[PDB]
Short mmCIF file of C-alpha atoms and ligand atoms in Angstrom, two decimals:
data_model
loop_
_atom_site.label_atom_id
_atom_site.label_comp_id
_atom_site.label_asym_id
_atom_site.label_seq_id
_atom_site.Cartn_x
_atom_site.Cartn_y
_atom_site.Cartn_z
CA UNK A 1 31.66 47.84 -20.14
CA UNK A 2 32.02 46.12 -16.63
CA UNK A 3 28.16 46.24 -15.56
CA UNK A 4 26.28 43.87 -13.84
CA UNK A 5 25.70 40.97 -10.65
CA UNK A 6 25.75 38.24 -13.92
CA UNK A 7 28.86 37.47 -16.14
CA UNK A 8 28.18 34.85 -18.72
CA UNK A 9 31.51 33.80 -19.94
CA UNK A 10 32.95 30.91 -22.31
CA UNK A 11 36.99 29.80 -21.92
CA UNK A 12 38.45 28.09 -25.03
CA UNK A 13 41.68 26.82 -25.70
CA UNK A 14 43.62 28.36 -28.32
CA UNK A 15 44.76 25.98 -31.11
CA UNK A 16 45.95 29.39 -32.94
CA UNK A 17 47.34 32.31 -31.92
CA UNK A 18 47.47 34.07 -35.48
CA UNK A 19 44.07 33.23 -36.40
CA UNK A 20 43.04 34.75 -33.08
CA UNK A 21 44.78 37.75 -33.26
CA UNK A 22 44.37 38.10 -37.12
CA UNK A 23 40.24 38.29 -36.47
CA UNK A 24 40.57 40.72 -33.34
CA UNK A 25 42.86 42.83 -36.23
CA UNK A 26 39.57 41.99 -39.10
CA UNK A 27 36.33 43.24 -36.61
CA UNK A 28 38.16 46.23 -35.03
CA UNK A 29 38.52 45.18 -31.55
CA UNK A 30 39.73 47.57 -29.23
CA UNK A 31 42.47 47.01 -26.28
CA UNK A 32 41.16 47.62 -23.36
CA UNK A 33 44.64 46.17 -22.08
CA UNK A 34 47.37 44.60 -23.37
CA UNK A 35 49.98 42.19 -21.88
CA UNK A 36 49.42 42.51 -18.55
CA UNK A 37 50.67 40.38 -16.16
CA UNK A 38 47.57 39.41 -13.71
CA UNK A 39 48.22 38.46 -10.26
CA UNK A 40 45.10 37.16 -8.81
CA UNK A 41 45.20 36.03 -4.62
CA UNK A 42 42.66 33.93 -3.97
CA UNK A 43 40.78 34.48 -0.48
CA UNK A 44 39.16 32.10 1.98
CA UNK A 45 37.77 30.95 5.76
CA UNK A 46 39.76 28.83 7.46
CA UNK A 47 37.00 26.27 7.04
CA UNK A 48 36.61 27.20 3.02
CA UNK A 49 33.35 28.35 3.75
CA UNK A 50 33.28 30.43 0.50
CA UNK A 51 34.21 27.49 -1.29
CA UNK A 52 31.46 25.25 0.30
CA UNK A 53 29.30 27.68 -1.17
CA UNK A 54 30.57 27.33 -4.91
CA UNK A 55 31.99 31.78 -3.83
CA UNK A 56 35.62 32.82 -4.83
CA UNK A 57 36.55 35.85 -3.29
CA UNK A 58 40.06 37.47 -5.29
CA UNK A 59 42.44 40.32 -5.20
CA UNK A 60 43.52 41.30 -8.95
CA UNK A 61 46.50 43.12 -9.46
CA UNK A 62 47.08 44.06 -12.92
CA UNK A 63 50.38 45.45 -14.36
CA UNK A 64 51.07 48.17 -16.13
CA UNK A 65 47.58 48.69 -16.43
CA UNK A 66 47.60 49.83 -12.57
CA UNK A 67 43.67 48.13 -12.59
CA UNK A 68 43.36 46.56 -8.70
CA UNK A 69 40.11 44.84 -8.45
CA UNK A 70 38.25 42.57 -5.52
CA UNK A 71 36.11 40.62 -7.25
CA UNK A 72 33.28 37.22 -5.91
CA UNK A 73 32.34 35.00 -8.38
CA UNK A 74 29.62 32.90 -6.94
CA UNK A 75 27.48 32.06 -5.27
CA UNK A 76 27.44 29.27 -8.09
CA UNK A 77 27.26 29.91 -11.93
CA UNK A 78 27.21 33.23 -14.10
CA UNK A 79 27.07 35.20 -10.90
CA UNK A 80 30.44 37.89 -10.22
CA UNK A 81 30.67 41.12 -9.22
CA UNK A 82 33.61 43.63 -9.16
CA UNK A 83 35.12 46.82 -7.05
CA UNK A 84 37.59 48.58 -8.02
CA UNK A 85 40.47 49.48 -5.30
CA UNK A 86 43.35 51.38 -4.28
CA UNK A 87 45.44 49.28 -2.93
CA UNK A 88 45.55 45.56 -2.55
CA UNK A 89 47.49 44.79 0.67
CA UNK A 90 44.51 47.32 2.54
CA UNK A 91 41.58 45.26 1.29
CA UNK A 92 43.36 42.04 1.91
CA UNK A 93 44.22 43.18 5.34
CA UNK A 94 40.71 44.13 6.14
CA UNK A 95 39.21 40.66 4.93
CA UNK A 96 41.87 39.30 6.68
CA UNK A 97 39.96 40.49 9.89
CA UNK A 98 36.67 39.23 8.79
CA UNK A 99 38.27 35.75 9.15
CA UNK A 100 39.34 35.93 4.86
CA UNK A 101 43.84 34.79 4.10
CA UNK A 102 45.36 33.95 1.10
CA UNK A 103 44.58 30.34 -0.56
CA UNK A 104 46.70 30.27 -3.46
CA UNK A 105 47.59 32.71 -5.84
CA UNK A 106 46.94 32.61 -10.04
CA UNK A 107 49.44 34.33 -11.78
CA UNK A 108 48.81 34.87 -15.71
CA UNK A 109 49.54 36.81 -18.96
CA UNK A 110 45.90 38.28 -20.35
CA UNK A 111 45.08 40.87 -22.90
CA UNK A 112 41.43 42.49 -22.94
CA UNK A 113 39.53 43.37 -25.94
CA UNK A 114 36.02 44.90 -26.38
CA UNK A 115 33.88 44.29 -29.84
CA UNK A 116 30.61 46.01 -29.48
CA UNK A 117 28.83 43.90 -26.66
CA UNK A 118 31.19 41.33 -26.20
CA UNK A 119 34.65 41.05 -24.32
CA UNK A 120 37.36 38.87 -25.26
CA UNK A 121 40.55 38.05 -23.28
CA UNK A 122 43.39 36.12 -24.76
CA UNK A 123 45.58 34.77 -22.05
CA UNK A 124 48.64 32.84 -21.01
CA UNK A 125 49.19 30.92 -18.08
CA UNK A 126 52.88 29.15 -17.93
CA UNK A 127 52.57 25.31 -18.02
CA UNK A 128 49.16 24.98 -19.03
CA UNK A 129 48.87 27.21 -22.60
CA UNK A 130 46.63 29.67 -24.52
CA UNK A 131 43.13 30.34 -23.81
CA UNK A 132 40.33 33.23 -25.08
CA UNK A 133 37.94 33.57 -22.70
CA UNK A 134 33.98 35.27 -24.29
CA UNK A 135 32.16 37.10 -21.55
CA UNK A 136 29.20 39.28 -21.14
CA UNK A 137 27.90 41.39 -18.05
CA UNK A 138 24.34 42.00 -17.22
CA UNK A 139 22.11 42.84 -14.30
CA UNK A 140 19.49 41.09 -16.27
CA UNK A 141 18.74 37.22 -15.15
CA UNK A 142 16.11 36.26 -17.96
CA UNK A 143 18.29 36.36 -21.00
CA UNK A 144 21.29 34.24 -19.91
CA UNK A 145 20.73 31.35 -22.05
CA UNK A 146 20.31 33.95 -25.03
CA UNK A 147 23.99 35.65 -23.99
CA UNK A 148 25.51 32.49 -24.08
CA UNK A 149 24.87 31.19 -27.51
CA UNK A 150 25.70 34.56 -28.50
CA UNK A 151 29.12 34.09 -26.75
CA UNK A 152 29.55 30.49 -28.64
CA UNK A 153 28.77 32.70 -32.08
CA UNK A 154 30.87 35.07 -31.10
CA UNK A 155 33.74 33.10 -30.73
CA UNK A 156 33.45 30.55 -33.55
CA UNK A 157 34.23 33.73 -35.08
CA UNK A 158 37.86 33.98 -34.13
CA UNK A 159 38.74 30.22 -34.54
CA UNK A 160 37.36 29.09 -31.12
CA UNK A 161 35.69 26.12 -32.17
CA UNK A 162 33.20 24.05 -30.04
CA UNK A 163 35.19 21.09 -28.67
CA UNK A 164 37.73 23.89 -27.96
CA UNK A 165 35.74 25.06 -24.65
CA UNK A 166 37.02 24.13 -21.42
CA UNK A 167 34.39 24.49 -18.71
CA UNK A 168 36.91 23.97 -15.96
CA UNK A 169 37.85 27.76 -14.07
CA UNK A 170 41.83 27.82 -13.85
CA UNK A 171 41.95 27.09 -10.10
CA UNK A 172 40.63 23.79 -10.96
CA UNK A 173 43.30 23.49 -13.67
CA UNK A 174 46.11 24.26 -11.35
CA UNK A 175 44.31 21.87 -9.10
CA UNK A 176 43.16 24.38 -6.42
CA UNK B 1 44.77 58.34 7.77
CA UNK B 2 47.43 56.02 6.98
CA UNK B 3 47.66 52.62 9.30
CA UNK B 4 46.11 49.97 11.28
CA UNK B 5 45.68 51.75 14.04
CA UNK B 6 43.97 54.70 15.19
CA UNK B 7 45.00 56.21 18.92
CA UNK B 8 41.91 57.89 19.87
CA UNK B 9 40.49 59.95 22.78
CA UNK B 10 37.05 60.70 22.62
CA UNK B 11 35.42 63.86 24.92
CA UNK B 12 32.07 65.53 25.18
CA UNK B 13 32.42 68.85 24.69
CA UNK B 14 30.52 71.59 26.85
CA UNK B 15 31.83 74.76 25.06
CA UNK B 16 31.61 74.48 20.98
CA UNK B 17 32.99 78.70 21.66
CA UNK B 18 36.07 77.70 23.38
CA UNK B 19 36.88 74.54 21.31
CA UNK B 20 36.62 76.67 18.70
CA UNK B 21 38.97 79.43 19.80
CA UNK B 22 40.80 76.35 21.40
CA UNK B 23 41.29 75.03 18.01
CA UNK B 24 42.07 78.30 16.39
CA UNK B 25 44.80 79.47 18.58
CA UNK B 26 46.97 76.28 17.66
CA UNK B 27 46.42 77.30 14.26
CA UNK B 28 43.97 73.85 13.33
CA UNK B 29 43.84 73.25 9.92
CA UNK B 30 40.15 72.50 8.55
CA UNK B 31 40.36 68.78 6.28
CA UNK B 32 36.24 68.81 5.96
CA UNK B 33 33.61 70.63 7.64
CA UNK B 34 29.81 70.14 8.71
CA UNK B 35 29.68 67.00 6.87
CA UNK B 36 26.43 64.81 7.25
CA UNK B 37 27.92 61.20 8.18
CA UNK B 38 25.67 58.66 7.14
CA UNK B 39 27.52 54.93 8.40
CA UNK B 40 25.71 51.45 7.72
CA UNK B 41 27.18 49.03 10.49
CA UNK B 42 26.93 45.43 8.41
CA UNK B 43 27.05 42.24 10.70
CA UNK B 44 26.25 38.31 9.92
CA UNK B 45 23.11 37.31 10.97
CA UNK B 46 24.43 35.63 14.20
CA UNK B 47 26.14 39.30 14.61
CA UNK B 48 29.32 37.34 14.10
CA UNK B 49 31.64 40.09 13.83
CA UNK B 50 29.92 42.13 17.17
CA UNK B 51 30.77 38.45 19.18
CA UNK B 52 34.51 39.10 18.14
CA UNK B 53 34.73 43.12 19.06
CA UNK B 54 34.52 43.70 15.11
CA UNK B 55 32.36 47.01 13.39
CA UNK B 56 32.39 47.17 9.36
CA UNK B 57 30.46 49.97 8.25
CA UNK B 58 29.96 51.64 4.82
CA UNK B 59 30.42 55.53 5.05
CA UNK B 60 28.98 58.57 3.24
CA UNK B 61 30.39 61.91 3.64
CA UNK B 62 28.22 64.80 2.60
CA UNK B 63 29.03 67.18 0.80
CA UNK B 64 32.62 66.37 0.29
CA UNK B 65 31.79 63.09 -1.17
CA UNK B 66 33.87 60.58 0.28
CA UNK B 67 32.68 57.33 0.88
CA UNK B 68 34.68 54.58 3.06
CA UNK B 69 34.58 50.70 3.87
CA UNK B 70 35.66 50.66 7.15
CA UNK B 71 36.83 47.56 9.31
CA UNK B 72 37.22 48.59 13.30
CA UNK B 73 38.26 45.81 15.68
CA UNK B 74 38.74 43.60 17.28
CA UNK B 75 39.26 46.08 20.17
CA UNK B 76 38.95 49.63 20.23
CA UNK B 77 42.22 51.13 18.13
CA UNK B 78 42.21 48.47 14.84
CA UNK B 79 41.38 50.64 12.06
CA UNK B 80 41.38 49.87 8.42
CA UNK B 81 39.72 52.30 5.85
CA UNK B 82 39.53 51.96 1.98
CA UNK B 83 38.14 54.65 -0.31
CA UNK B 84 35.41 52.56 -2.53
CA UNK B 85 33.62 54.24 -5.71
CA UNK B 86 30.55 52.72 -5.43
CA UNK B 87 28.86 51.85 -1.98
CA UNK B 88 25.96 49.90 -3.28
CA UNK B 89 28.38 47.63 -5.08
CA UNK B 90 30.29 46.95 -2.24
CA UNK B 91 27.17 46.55 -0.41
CA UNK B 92 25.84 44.20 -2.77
CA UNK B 93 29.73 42.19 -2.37
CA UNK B 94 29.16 42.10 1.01
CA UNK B 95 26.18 40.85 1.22
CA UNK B 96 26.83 37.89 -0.73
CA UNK B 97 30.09 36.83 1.77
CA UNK B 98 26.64 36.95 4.78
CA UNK B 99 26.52 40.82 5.81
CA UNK B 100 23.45 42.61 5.97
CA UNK B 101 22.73 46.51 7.27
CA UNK B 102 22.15 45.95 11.08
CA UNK B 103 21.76 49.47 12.12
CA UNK B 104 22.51 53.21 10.92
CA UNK B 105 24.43 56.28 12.77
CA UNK B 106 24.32 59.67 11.90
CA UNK B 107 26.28 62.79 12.98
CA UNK B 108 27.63 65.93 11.54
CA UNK B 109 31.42 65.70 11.41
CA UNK B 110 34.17 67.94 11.13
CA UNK B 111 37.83 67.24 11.05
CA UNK B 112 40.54 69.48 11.75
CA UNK B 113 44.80 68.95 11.48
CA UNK B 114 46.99 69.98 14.15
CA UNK B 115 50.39 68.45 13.02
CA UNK B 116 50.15 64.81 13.35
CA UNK B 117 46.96 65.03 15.33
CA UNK B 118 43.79 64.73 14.11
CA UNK B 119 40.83 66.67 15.90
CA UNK B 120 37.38 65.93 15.20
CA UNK B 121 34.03 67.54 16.19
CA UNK B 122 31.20 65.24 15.87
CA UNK B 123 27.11 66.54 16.87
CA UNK B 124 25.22 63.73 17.23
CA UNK B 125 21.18 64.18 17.66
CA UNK B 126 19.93 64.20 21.28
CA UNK B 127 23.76 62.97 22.49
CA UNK B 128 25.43 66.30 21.52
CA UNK B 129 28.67 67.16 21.13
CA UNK B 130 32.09 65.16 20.85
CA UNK B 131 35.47 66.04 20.21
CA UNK B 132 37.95 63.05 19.31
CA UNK B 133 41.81 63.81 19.25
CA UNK B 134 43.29 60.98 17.42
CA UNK B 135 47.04 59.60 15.94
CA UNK B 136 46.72 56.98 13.40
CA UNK B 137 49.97 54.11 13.20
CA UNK B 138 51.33 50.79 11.47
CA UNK B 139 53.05 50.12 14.31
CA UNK B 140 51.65 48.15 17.52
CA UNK B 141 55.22 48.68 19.02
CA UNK B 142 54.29 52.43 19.40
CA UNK B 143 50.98 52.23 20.76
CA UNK B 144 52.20 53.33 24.12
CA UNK B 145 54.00 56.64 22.75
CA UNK B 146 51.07 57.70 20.88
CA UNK B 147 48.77 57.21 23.74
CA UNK B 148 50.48 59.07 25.88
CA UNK B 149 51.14 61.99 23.17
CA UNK B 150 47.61 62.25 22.69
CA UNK B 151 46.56 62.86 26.61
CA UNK B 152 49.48 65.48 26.24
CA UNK B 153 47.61 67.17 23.55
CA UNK B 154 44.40 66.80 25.11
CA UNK B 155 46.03 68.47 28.09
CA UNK B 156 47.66 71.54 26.73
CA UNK B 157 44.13 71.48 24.42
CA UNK B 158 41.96 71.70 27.17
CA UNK B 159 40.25 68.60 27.03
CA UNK B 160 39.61 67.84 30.16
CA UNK B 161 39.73 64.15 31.79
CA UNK B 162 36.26 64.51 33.46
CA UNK B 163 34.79 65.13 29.95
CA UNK B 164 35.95 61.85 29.38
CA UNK B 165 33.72 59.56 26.87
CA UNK B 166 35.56 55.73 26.90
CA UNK B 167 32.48 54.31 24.65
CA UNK B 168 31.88 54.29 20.91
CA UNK B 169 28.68 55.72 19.06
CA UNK B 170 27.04 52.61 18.74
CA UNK B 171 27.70 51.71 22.67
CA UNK B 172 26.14 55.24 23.31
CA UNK B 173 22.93 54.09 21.10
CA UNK B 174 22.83 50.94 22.36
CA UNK B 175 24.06 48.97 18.91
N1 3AT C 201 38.14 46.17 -14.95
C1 3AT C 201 37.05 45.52 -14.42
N2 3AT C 201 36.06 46.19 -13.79
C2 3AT C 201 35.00 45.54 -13.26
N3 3AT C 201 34.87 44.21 -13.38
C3 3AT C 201 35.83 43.49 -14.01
C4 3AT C 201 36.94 44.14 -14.54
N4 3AT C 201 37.74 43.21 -15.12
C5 3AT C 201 37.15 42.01 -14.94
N5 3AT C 201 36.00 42.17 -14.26
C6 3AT C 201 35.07 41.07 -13.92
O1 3AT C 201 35.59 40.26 -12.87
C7 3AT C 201 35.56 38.87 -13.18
C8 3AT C 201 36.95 38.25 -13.01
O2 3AT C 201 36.86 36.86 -13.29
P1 3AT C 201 37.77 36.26 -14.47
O3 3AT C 201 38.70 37.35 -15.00
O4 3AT C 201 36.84 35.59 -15.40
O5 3AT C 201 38.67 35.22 -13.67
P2 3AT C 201 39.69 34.16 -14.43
O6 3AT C 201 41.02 34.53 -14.03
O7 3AT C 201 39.26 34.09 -15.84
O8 3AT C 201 39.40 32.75 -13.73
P3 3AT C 201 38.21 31.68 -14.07
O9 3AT C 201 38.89 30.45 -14.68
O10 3AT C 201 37.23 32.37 -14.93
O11 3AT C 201 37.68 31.42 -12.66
C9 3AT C 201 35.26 38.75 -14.71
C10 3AT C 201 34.79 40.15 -15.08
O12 3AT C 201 33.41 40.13 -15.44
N1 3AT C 202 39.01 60.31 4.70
C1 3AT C 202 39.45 59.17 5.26
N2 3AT C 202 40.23 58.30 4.58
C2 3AT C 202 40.64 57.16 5.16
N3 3AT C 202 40.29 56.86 6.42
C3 3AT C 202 39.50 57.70 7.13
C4 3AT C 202 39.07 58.88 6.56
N4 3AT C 202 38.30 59.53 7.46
C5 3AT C 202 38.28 58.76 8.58
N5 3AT C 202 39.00 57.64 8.38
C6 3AT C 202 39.26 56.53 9.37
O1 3AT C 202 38.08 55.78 9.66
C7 3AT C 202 37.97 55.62 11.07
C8 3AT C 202 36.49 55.51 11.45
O2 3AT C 202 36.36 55.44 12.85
P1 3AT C 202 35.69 56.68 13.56
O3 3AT C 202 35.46 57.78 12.54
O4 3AT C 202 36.40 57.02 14.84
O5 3AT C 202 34.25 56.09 13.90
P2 3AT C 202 33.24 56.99 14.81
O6 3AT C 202 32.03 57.31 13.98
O7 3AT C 202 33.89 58.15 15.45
O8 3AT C 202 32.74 55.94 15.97
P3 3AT C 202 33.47 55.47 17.36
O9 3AT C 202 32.71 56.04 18.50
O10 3AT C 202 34.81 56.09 17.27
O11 3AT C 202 33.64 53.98 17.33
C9 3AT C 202 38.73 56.64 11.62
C10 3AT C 202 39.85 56.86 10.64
O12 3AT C 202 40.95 56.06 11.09
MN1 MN C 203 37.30 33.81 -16.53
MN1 MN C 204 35.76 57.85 16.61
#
């Protein structure tokens, strides 16, 4: 379900909880996980030299699900990949050589579901409020455009309504 | 293979036979044997990490499996290992933060227990045979202990200080 150099992925604010979660209930989505409390560190240069090149580089911590991920998003848009790992505080201490120390940190409340192609991630981060986040992975540049829209579809589906997206990435909203 | 640190003492070996009656008489325990070591060194393309005494290298271990991301330096006893599932995906990772396969080393490797120590019997092509005993800590503040208990156990071993080998593989090779 996790395949790919390319996620294409949508974030909406969520007007409506019920709606949301009544339509996950309606087209049979499947938990991948549920409630987990996400602690994502956020790595860079001294410099930001990852930043300067539009790259986040994070440790994800995921509880109870046990999931511990290292994960860069960039360079630029619709471009992540992700490891899985055993143990954060190794990796971190091993970029920390390479010149890599904690930024900030994002912590957040986010549920994963799967229907068919799609993922869909309700989540809660205090102070700012409910979003659903659409996403997609594929090694496959040339139908991007095409996995979008289908993302937009998607999640008019549950309630997520155009003017709804927010195309700002939650360190920007917690003005990182 | 827990820590930050690896003690190490690294010999040529002249005997394989007596090693291998050395290493039997202290009752070694085998971890993995005759593996085919396959390590990518990675560097920036201004070798970056080589200018600061740093090695990161991707290893496969055939046939028990195990594949590491490895982060030596700087210096010669920093050492950080993580298992990883998937070495091309790392690889790919890495590549995007600017490192890029600089050079290869092989070797058949096999690693034997003796209590804490760790002794390991390397055959490298044309170079020949190695035998490393190693300690691996957390703590800097014991450094000095574990250096000293490992030329203990070379001792009553029967590596010998004239067998001596102070460089690294890819010194050796020229990397
Ligand atoms: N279990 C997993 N295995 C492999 N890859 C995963 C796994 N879970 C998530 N990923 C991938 O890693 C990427 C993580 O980015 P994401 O979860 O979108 O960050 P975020 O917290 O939503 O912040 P943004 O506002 O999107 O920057 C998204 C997803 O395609
Ligand atoms: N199975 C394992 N799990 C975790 N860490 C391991 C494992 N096997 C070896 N390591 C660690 O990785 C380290 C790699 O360094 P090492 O194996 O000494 O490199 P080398 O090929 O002998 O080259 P040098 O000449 O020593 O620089 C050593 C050890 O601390
Ligand atoms: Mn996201
Ligand atoms: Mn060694």
């Amino acid at each position: 379900h996790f395949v790919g150099k390319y996620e294409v992925e949508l974030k909406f604010r969520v007007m409506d909880l019920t709606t949301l979660h009544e339509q996950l209930v309606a087209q049979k989505a499947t938990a991948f996980t549920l409630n987990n409390h996400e602690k994502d560190i956020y790595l860079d240069a001294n410099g930001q030299d990852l930043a300067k090149q539009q790259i986040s580089m994070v440790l994800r911590e995921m509880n109870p699900s046990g999931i511990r991920l290292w994960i860069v998003k960039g360079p630029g848009a619709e471009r992540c990949e992700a490891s899985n790992i055993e143990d954060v505080s190794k990796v971190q201490s091993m970029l920390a050589t390479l010149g890599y120390h904690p930024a900030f940190t994002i912590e957040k409340q986010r549920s994963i579901y799967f229907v068919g192609k799609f993922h869909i991630t309700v989540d809660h981060l205090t102070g700012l409020g409910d979003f659903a986040e659409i996403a997609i992975m594929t090694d496959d540049a040339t139908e991007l455009d095409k996995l979008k829209a289908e993302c937009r579809d998607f999640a008019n589906t549950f309630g997520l309504q155009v003017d709804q997206q927010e195309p700002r990435s939650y360190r920007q909203l917690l003005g990182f």
